[model samples]
Target: GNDQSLRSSLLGLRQLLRELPGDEAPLDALAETVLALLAQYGSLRIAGLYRVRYDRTPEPQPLATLGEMPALDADDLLVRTCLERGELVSVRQELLERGEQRAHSALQVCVPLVDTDGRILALLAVEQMPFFVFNERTFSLLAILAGHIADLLQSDRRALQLADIDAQRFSQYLKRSLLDARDHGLPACLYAFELTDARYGEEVQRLLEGSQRGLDVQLRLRNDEGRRVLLVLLPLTSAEGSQGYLQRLRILFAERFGQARELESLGVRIRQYELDAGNDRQALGHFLFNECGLNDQQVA
Candidate 1:
């Protein structure tokens, strides 16, 4: 029975998780995953999963909710207590918080989702299960699930870091694209795209990838300190030929991102430089430093 339930618990969790669409926010799927498991094992009145946000704050960021529960408070019971203690906060303790003279209550339990080393990473709260369903084995399985969540969180984080690196490595990709265009006697153009709001960086990344042609290269770089630069190298394209693409991109930001994000936000606006069809890499330096009119002290 122990082995069977444990196997089903993990298998069922993985299935539901994979069913979530890629477009759905990651935290929503995570919260739903926790609810699915807890409800299947026992029952649920209220359930929640919260992750400690170290990037922006130390507060617990609620990922998902159960039963239209009250708005999450970082200072609330389960979340607040879990962070202060590195271990489980039992139902008995939850009930005692009322300053009531009782030792036990019907509140299910609050557990710290942790890893193998018992380092608490998140908080889980449950209220009113389906009678006496929870057991020692169930607790053991939940601990395993929590550890896996922590592992997956780190995996997602690493993947994002890699994406940032790949986006910034445009110069290297541009060189190769330039060489190919020169060898084939194809005209090439370089574009300088900048966004006013740094908040739109991720959105712009997706837009750039969608905009790239099969032979085109897209890169994000720093033109000057604190200046966000999106540089594009398009083979078989001249400054004039790239106009339609530039116009479409401008329309996309206003229609999709709710403003003229491309035009009004541009530092140098949307401008293109023609690369010499005679020599590829040799022409880029001249175009970048001189024709682009960007000085070393003024631009990176």
Candidate 2:
């Protein structure tokens, strides 16, 4: 009997592999993919995908649902267990371990969509599924599917973030970088470049972009006096670590346009400031607007 069950379970896995969405699929498609694969387990009717949001309260908001799903709370027992353990948790098993007689819950299984670093990025909740379908093999398949989906979700989000910079600089990216550095006890440096000629600002921006690492962010904005300015935020870097980058940019300014003998002669003024270990919102605002001469409105 066990042999036959495993054989069919393998077949189910094969079918799932064939049906799984590609990495280019959006979040909604991923949700549908989860539901599709789980349905092979038999009567796994109701399911919902919740996207975890760290920026606000009431995380794991419902992104898509096949059938009716009750509101989920980050404080929910299964949710906490899933996040705390970073794995799939069975509702019946948890209740039995707790010595609770009432084991009937809307959620039969809570699967955490965890990234490579073991961070829970989202939650997959199974609301209705036959008890017989909740076997060891079923749980194993769920774990596999959850991992694949999580990886795709993470990669897609990262790709979108980099693509956003191509269109225009998002101020929130800089804000988050500064706050993350403060929270994680890492160093972050900011460089302000004032271009002498507004017309050449685009060219300088391209040069700066080419010089940055994947983690660095560059912003091209104007000051209050309509003077073009370029700002570079170097995460996990200090003043000493950034000297080479600064020197390289100076060489770029001199080499790119032979009209000027040096960076200053080319009408470019650059200043570097390292954020304090303990970053404050007010202090950041002061530095950006006052010290850097960046237009407060543009950043806002």
Candidate 3:
């Protein structure tokens, strides 16, 4: 289940099959296609799709927009109009209401994005720097596109919830892997380090990647008390021989940080723990608190 082992590179039939074009394996296809189609029309300068959820506090959250423009806010007039009326809204015919007048840019077309049940879920807004003439067809196409977008947005929400069960990123849920390793007779240990300041802590995780050996079996967890640190489990090496490996991390950080004493200056304490064939089963929870709260010494 380790993501690192099989993630080496493309090989065998996997290489050719993976090369299939758009519609097959497009990333975030809903946003990319919607933005691309809008480019065909010269009058449409800036365009964005906003997610609207009424069950929670109602607001427009931009799903995607044309290059450079920031995400549309709740007070965005085009989005506000479509949600309020549950229909197409264009500034050409309707006079600017107080909410519409508050918009940062003038809108040419706005359409309600709706789910299959005909409930408004989002709004699609597109316009130029200034108001531009738009035909009735513009409204119809945007409305049709919004319906498909709504379904994609809903599916993505469900996918995200499901992904939480086995997330790919740095989640604390992987602590169980340490226990499993111990049961299988693998030499296991824990190494915890402290950070000096908040700003410096943020970049340390990326640096740790360069220091680990392939298949060295370290599961990294990030903790924040007053600062951040890496709580890493080394499944194949004991604490006695692990210092040489751990010291490389400090040495590399010093060369990069431009000071031999940078790690100590950063308030780091290289705390470690050895499982010793199966004695420290309870140390798992303790290490979560940085070097195992009551059990503080490294190795023997």
Candidate 4:
């Protein structure tokens, strides 16, 4: 029966959603899970799942793509509309501007997976599907499924957040640095050490702990790859002062580890901001999230 088809599709998709991988599941795995459901129930052939990377420019990054679909960023017209409307955008109508771009027109639908806080965490773009199955009922099911996918992403993120106390402390420390600089003209510098190889971890840790001054604050955590990250915040310090410290630290590292050239292998990214009264909140957020955020790339 027609009713039975809808009922089974709903149940089938629900089952697939439930079968999704647990905490710390990579975005690609999550995308495949969702796309599989769509492929099965909605007769979807081509689709792409994009995960929102909040740290850098707050844009959607492609996690998985089933077929040849043009890549989309946050600036895409369809993505902008979906984010602004906080709902799915169907390209079947004239909502899109005429003659602006045809690549987006190939996508029949774009669904936003919004979190509880009203942030769109991910987007599902469907390109190919059977015309008979691409009806209101199917779109409604997609809307419901998007909610579940959002929940999955939220839960995964929460689990990671709960496991890392260093991230919380870093945010608070950054906020303090921002306030002190804006209100009192105090200066601070931030440094991030991303160590991918664990062989040199203990040596690096020992050196950092021994060399840091009592006034400096250090937070240590691991990225998704389980690689160690060291963040150091030096309050009341200038960017030049931080550079001097890093230069000395490099010499110390060479003497201690006996491998001056291998230091580059550790993948260290240094960011020192000379805190100023004129710095805005947007700048702070960019520095904290983009420059110092825990990223997937085996980087800090």
Give lDDT per model, in order.
0.54, 0.61, 0.50, 0.62
Tens digits of lDDT, candidate 4, 1-300? 332343354445445545766544544555676666555656677888777656312344567777776665446666667767767777664423353235445567878776445667777777766667666777765765565456445544444565354444345445555654664465677777877567777778778778865346677767545666677876545666677778888988888875656566655545655667877756654664565556433222
Error of 2 at 213 (Å): 4.0
Count backbone overlaps in model 1.
0
Q: Predictions ranked by TM-score, top down?
A: 2, 4, 1, 3
User: How far off is residue 140 in model 2, in Å?
Assistant: 30
Q: TM-score for each prediction?
A: 0.39, 0.48, 0.36, 0.41
For candidate 3, the per-residue lDDT at 235 reads: 40
Candidate 3 runs further than 4 Å off = 1-184, 216-224, 290-300
Model 2 over residues 50-155: C-alpha lDDT tens digits?
7665631225557677677677644767767776777788866555456452354446787877655455667777776656677676776566546544543554
Clashing pairs in 2: none
lDDT of 1 by residue, 1-300 (tens): 343353355456556555767776554556667666655654556666666554212333467667744445435454456557754554453344464422332345666655433445566766544434455545544554555454333324434554454443344345433543553344557787655466666576567667775435666555544556667776445555567667777786667665835455533346577666556555566656554444454222
Question: Which structure is stronger by TM-score: 1 or 3?
Answer: 1
Model 1, TM vs. native:
0.39
